[PDB]
């Protein structure tokens, strides 16, 4: 209900070319099943992620489970039940680029969606059947949750 | 009385007028009660390259703590910055004169560690 | 399978000249699918089972494996799985992990060295793989890349055992090997790695007689060639200037003198430096640097290796032209040393650069021995008019 | 896991690439192989070929744990009517058992017979001025004499009047190296 | 006269005792004329080089470069303190970039609240690797060094002087052209106020800790000075024995001086690069150089590693005495230290001969500055 | 050849027109040959402009000062009008010309 995407990933690399920023690092992750790559900037301070972790990641268009489609204002007093209580790390940001392996004759097979969470970048390279919910210059959430 | 616009200078060609005068409760302060008397620009240093101002400030902390008027003849070789830092470290300070200033308005301690210490200023 | 057959027939009828031209046109097929690579390398193994001409098959397999390493295969595990090295498992597994990392681990070479220099060595074809010796040259003779003085002699002993020992496979068993020249090989490679470690250039001029003693050995000469490649091709190197720095280039002349199989790599280094535009140098100084490199190409031409050199000079006069004065200097220095009789390929290749595009500049003041006129007269006397 | 044939076709079925993809040892666990063994005749030939080539990129101890299951996948792979799967099974049948791949590929295949016959004739007639391997730039003189015969001399294309000025260069630098050695 | 910071750059007025002249227009007609022609919002973009002249001056520029990094996060109270200073804020607190565990705003969101209207620019940070746009990650920059402002919101990248400065095509020039000129006045004021008030929380300094490299770097510097000094001495012993050969086009002495200057410039450059590989990303010299606010890489190399060759009239320190530069040197001494090369840095301090040669180079600079002024002013007068 | 590949608007290909334009505009372009003649004439004008520029600029550089920043204006039009450039467009190329 408003979810654009949902998959379980598995952390393979943490910022392998060196650590450019001390508080935020990027995670090179492969999916558990869908064969797709995800490069994710996460705050290590408030939410530490170690290598070899496994996490669920659910891009949702809104947190409110009815799909009420909020504007994006900070409402800390709204007691409408959101989906963020299932999760433990919610990032809001806009998706800024959907490039893909396309040709001027036939369709695109492998898509690559780009999304910035404030400044924290995430590239999700997968197949077009899984990234079809993404639209350029829309507002998405992140909703990751680590699990053993 | 020194007011803003009054032109002060170091002993290194680091002149500058008074921009503003804050009271003591607005001025930042260390873990002890020490506020600055002057706060100079950090951008006044790196293109002008008065490293001797910084070394005067470091030797000033060492001098005011040790209780002796410190020596700054130019061509010495018995005083370099590493000996000054090893003398400063014994009086319970950071090696390189940095000291955690607290903010004077909000009270939240400043994320960077402000270089502080006594220099010799000249009123022009 | 049949396309592979006819392309192998094409290359094996071609030779060393066709080794450069046909091998990407052969390797884009057999590295397209890695299963096709497995099929092709298995055929290379079964054909290289024979000692009656299988060395060229092994060579083509090694260039296909080198192209697979370039394009992005981890094809060393396939290479070790084809080999007899997997009959002795743990050494081959160590080589598998190390050639999958593409770098030298000292602990891994202690694992190897514990298995070598005993009374049961592995069959020496496990260490003769050329990518492994290339990683040795990278990890040992880079001008930086210091080696920590303790497993150093283990490295030198492994390279000496690789490039030294002989064997007699009398029906898949050895009965007579020897180790009596790897002490000299070890001493030579140790002296050369010390000379590459000391990094002090007056000392490089001083111990140059010992370095000339060292480059009598082929593995030493290949290593010095890679070190001079990695030293001279540093940008803004040519700022020490003695006779426009011919010292390392005199080592090029020594490598070209004492051996013959390194000549393609030597020519590749010289034409890499000749194509490289040297910024921040004077233009006359650049021109005399090019004259020095052409002196080295003349020295390669003197020791037999002539036809790729003259082919490159024709290629850079015709296609994407260099300075004409450099080609004139090359013609001047080549014709001051050669004498008849003349093989027809050299005449056929040396004619159009001389007769087209700067006839006049070759003769200025020679007199006592006649210029190009003698070569023109001999060229009329050889061929059938000129045709 | 559940639906593991679809899982192999998902993680390995990008047919636009034909090499063994990396992290193939992290995609081949013994439980996953024992899930492959019952659904092996269902998945496509390209993914099956990726699988059979990825079974060689495992480390030796993991192959030595459960080589029987890998041999069962090999025996099911040799029955398939695909040419590539049959040929790769014929090569790869000896890898978990011995460690070395097969070299006797000659029976059951007229292709291997034609290639080996034509190429044994071609190799037998092409021994003149043979291409020495890339190892021959390294090993010594007498070791090369042991390996692949003596040194083939270059073609004397001309006659040399006088030695070039590089002889003068090496003479002068040897004199300089004597003079520097005595300081 | 309290005047603002970004108007320093067109005025060239650096507050160290500068005094300015203030004219008052007396008629109402000339008051409207000055308001409609010579207002500083109407004089942002100059006609001489079709770029702005205001830009963002030094301390706001370093604080905005540290502000817009990827690892900057802001608590709710610090956000509400910063948004108090935006004049152009419509009263809506943005959705955080981090909702859970803690509501935590990234500094690029507050900077997107600054950036007015809906303007779209793509710039590159000063330390953007040139091999980044070749391979992968050309749209997901691992160093966060690719500035994209898009639909009036800062997507990504760190804003150095190539983003907010007086370079053409910058963010402020496009804010002038796409939006109005009152809107750019607001944009300058909002950047200055809210980035100074974040800088109270952050704080920025410079120190003697920022001028000291670790001992491995000092060993590298001293090994490079020793190697180049021995190389100059062996060039000298080649030059004495007539073994140096002349470069075609000049004398043997000018060939020698080219060799010595080439070795010493290579030493200065190699020691300068080996110094500036060791700042550890918190060094405030690097903080001001990377933002481009004040200084350059040469100042870092001269403070940490080596001052370098001192020059008088484009060549080395001449022989003012009979065939020697100072009476401490032997006659005909063409070495590094005799002829003005300074191997010490400003952290270690100069030896007295190096002090005097450094004073010579500085006197040449002051002579240039003092003699330039009258001739340039007379050229300006004739042209007008 | 890079100029002809990048600027000509090859109309004979079906599938490229199907991806770039909507199907009514596709059959409008493919049916009429007058529109094909006008597209060929504007490529004629761009070859003429290429020869004019190569006379004007013999040094191969193109950093030239001009008033309207057209690429930024195209990108502003994209961001205002919410393009989603994966979908086939709906402006007729004869309206562009
Ligand atoms: Mg002033």
Swiss-Prot record, chain C:
Its cellular-component GO annotations read: membrane; NELF complex; nucleoplasm; nucleus
Impact of changing residue 187 to M on the protein? Reduces RNA binding
- Effect on the protein upon substituting residue 171 to M: Reduces RNA binding
A Gene Ontology biological process noted in the UniProt record is:
negative regulation of transcription elongation by RNA polymerase II
- Record keyword Zinc present: no
Has keyword Transcription?
Answer: yes
Molecular function (GO) terms for this protein are:
RNA binding
Provide the alphabetized UniProt keywords. Nucleus, Repressor, RNA-binding, Transcription, Transcription regulation
Predominant cellular place of this UniProt entry's protein: nucleus
Q: Where in the cell is it found?
A: Nucleus
Tissue expression, per UniProt? Answer: Widely expressed. Expressed in heart, brain, lung, placenta, liver, skeletal and cardiac muscle, adrenal, thyroid, kidney and pancreas.
Q: What is the effect of changing residue 90 to Q?
A: Reduces RNA binding
Q: Fill in the subunit field for this protein.
A: The NELF complex is composed of NELFA, NELFB, NELFCD (isoform NELF-C or isoform NELF-D) and NELFE; NELFA and NELFCD form a stable subcomplex that binds primarily through NELFCD to the N-terminus of NELFB. Binds RNA which may help to stabilize the NELF complex on nucleic acid. In vitro, the NELFA:NELFCD subcomplex binds to ssDNA and ssRNA in a sequence- and structure-dependent manner. Interacts with ARAF. Interacts with PCF11. Interacts with KAT8.
Function text: Essential component of the NELF complex, a complex that negatively regulates the elongation of transcription by RNA polymerase II. The NELF complex, which acts via an association with the DSIF complex and causes transcriptional pausing, is counteracted by the P-TEFb kinase complex.
Give the UniProt family note: Belongs to the NELF-D family.
Q: What is this protein's record name?
A: Negative elongation factor C/D
What is the protein's species of origin? Homo sapiens (Human)
* Taxonomic path: Eukaryota, Metazoa, Chordata, Craniata, Vertebrata
Q: Which residues of the full protein are shown?
A: 202 to 590 of 590
Curated annotation (Swiss-Prot), chain D:
Query: Residues in domain HDAg?
Result: 84-183
Q: Which residues form the signal peptide?
A: none
PTM Phosphothreonine: list the residues: 152
Expression tissues: Ubiquitous. Expressed in heart, brain, placenta, liver, skeletal muscle, kidney and pancreas. Expressed at lower level in adult lung. Expressed in fetal brain, lung, liver and kidney.
Please name every pair of cysteines joined by a disulfide bond in this record: none
Q: Where is this region: NELF-C/D-binding?
A: 120-183
Q: Where in the cell is it found?
A: Nucleus
Comment block on domains: The HDAg-like domain is essential for transcriptional repression, and mediates the interaction with the RNA polymerase II complex.
Self-association and partners:
The NELF complex is composed of NELFA, NELFB, NELFCD (isoform NELF-C or isoform NELF-D) and NELFE; NELFA and NELFCD form a stable subcomplex that binds to the N-terminus of NELFB. In vitro, the NELFA:NELFCD subcomplex binds to ssDNA and ssRNA in a sequence- and structure-dependent manner. Interacts with the RNA polymerase II complex when it is not phosphorylated by P-TEFb.
Function of the molecule: Essential component of the NELF complex, a complex that negatively regulates the elongation of transcription by RNA polymerase II. The NELF complex, which acts via an association with the DSIF complex and causes transcriptional pausing, is counteracted by the P-TEFb kinase complex.
> Could you say which protein family the record assigns here?
Belongs to the NELF-A family.
Name of the protein: Negative elongation factor A
Q: Which organism is it from?
A: Homo sapiens (Human)
């Amino acid at each position: 209900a408003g979810i654009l995407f949902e998959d379980i990933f598995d952390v393979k690399d943490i910022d392998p070319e060196g650590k450019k920023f001390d508080r935020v690092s990027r995670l090179h992750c492969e999916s558990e099943s869908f064969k797709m790559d995800l490069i994710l900037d996460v705050n290590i301070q408030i939410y530490p992620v170690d290598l070899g972790d496994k996490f669920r990641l659910v891009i949702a268009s809104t947190l409110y489970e009815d799909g009420t489609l909020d504007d994006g204002e900070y409402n800390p007093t709204d007691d409408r039940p959101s989906r963020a209580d299932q999760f433990e790390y919610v990032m809001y940001g806009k998706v800024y680029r959907i490039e893909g392996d396309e040709t001027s004759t036939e369709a695109a097979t492998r898509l690559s969606a780009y999304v910035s969470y404030g400044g924290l970048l995430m590239r999700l390279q997968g197949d077009a059947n899984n990234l079809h919910g993404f639209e350029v210059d829309s507002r998405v959430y992140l909703l990751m949750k680590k699990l053993a | 009385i020194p007011q803003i616009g009054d032109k002060f200078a170091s002993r290194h060609g680091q002149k500058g007028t008074c921009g503003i005068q804050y009271r003591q409760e607005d001025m930042p302060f260390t873990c002890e009660g020490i506020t600055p008397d002057i706060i100079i620009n950090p951008h006044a240093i790196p293109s002008r390259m008065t490293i001797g101002h910084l070394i005067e400030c470091l030797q000033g902390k060492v001098s005011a703590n040790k209780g002796e008027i410190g020596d700054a003849t130019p061509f010495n070789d018995a005083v370099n910055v590493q000996k000054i830092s090893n003398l400063l470290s014994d009086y319970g300070y950071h090696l390189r004169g940095n000291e955690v200033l607290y903010n004077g308005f909000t009270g939240r301690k400043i994320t960077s560690q402000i270089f502080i210490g006594p220099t010799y200023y000249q009123r022009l | 399978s049949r396309v592979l057959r006819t392309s192998l027939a094409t290359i094996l009828d071609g030779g060393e000249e066709n080794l450069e031209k046909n091998l990407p046109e052969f390797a884009k097929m057999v590295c397209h699918g890695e299963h096709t690579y497995l099929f092709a390398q298995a055929m290379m193994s079964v054909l290289a089972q024979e000692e009656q001409g299988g060395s060229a098959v092994r060579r083509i397999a090694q260039e296909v494996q080198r192209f697979a390493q370039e394009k992005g295969h981890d094809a060393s595990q396939i290479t070790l799985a084809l080999g007899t090295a997997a009959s002795y498992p743990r050494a081959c597994q160590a080589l598998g992990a190390m050639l999958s990392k593409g770098a030298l681990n000292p602990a891994d070479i202690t694992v190897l060295f514990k298995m070598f220099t005993s009374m049961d060595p592995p069959p020496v074809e496990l260490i003769r793989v050329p990518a492994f010796l290339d990683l040795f040259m990278q990890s040992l003779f880079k001008p930086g890349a210091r080696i920590n003085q303790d497993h150093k002699h283990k490295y030198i002993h492994i390279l000496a055992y690789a490039a030294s020992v002989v064997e007699t496979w009398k029906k898949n068993k050895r009965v007579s090997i020897n180790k009596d020249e790897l002490k000299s090989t070890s001493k030579a490679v140790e002296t050369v790695h010390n000379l590459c470690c000391n990094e002090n250039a007056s000392e490089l001029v001083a111990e140059l007689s010992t370095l000339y003693q060292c480059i009598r050995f082929p593995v030493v000469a290949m290593g010095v060639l890679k070190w001079v490649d990695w030293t001279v091709s540093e940008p803004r190197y040519f700022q020490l200037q003695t006779d426009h720095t011919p010292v390392h280039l005199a080592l090029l002349d020594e490598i070209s003198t004492c051996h013959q199989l390194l000549h393609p790599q030597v020519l590749q280094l010289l034409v890499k430096l000749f194509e490289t535009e040297h910024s921040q140098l004077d233009v006359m100084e650049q021109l005399e640097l090019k004259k020095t490199l052409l002196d080295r190409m003349v020295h390669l031409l003197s020791r037999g290796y002539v036809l790729p050199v003259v082919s490159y000079i024709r290629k850079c006069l015709e296609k994407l032209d260099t300075d004409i004065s450099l080609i004139r200097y090359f013609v001047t220095e080549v014709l001051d040393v050669i004498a008849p009789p003349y093989t027809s390929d050299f005449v056929q290749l040396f004619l159009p650069i001389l007769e087209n595009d700067s006839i006049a500049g070759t003769i200025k003041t020679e007199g006592e021995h006649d210029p190009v006129t003698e070569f023109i007269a001999h060229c009329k006397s050889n061929f059938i008019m000129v045709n | 896991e559940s639906d593991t044939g679809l899982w192999l076709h998902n993680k390995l079925g990008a047919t636009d690439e034909l090499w063994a993809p990396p992290s193939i040892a992290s995609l081949l666990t013994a439980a996953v192989i024992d899930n492959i063994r019952l659904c092996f005749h269902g998945l496509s030939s390209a993914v099956k070929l990726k699988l059979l080539l990825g079974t060689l990129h495992l480390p030796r101890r993991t192959v030595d744990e459960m080589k029987g299951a890998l041999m069962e996948i090999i025996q099911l792979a040799s029955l398939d009517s695909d040419p590539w799967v049959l040929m790769v099974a014929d090569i790869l049948k000896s890898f978990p058992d011995t460690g070395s791949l097969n070299l006797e590929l000659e029976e059951q295949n007229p292709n291997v017979q034609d290639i080996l016959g034509e190429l044994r004739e071609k190799v037998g007639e092409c021994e003149a001025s043979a291409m020495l391997p890339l190892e021959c730039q390294y090993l010594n003189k007498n070791a090369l004499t042991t390996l692949a015969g003596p040194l083939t001399p270059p073609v004397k294309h001309f006659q040399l009047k006088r030695k070039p000025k590089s002889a003068t260069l090496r003479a002068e630098l040897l004199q300089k190296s004597t003079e520097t050695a005595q300081q | 006269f309290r005047l603002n910071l970004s108007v320093t750059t067109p005025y060239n007025a650096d507050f160290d005792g500068d005094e300015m002249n203030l004219h008052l227009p007396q008629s109402l007609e000339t008051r409207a004329e000055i308001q409609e022609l010579a207002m500083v919002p109407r004089m942002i973009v100059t006609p001489q080089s079709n770029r702005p002249v205001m830009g963002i001056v030094q301390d706001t520029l370093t604080a905005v470069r540290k502000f817009t990094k990827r690892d900057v996060f802001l608590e709710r109270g610090e956000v509400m303190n910063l948004l108090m200073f935006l004049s152009t804020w419509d009263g809506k607190v943005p959705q955080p970039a981090i909702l859970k565990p803690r509501p935590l705003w990234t500094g690029k969101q507050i900077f997107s609240l600054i950036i007015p209207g809906h303007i779209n620019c793509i710039r590159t940070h000063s330390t953007h690797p040139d091999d980044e746009d070749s391979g992968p990650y050309k749209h997901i920059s691992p160093g966060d060094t690719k500035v994209v402002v898009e639909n009036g919101e800062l997507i990504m990248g760190i804003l150095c002087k190539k983003s907010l400065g007086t370079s053409a095509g910058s963010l402020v020039h496009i804010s002038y052209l796409e939006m109005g000129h009152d809107i750019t006045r607001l944009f300058y004021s909002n950047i200055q106020t809210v980035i100074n008030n974040w800088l109270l929380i952050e704080g920025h300094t410079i120190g003697i800790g920022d001028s000291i490299a670790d001992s491995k770097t000092y060993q590298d510097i001293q090994n490079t000075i020793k190697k180049a000094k021995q190389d100059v001495i062996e060039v000298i012993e080649k030059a004495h024995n007539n073994e140096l050969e002349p470069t075609p086009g000049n004398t043997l002495r000018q060939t020698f001086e080219n060799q010595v200057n080439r070795i010493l410039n290579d030493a200065r450059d190699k020691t300068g690069s080996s110094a500036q590989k060791s700042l550890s990303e918190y060094n405030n010299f690097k903080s001001m150089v990377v933002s481009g606010a004040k200084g350059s890489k040469i100042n870092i190399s001269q403070v940490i590693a080596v001052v370098g060759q001192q020059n008088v009239e484009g060549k080395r320190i001449p022989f003012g005495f009979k065939h020697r530069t100072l009476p401490h040197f032997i006659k005909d001494d063409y070495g590094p230290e005799s002829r003005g090369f300074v191997e010490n840095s400003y952290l270690a301090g100069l030896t007295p001969t190096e002090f005097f040669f450094h004073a010579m180079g500085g006197r040449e600079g002051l002579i240039d500055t003092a003699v330039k002024t009258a001739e340039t002013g007379y050229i300006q007068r004739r042209l007008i | 050849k890079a100029f002809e590949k990048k600027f000509r608007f090859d109309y004979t290909n079906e599938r490229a027109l199907r991806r770039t334009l909507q199907e009514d505009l596709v059959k409008d372009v493919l049916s009429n040959a007058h529109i094909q003649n006008e597209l060929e004439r504007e490529f004629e004008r761009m070859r003429e402009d290429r020869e004019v520029l190569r006379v004007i600029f013999p040094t191969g550089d193109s950093k030239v000062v001009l008033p309207c920043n057209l690429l930024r204006m195209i990108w502003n039009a994209q961001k205002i009008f919410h393009i989603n450039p994966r979908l086939p467009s709906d402006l007729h190329p004869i309206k562009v010309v």
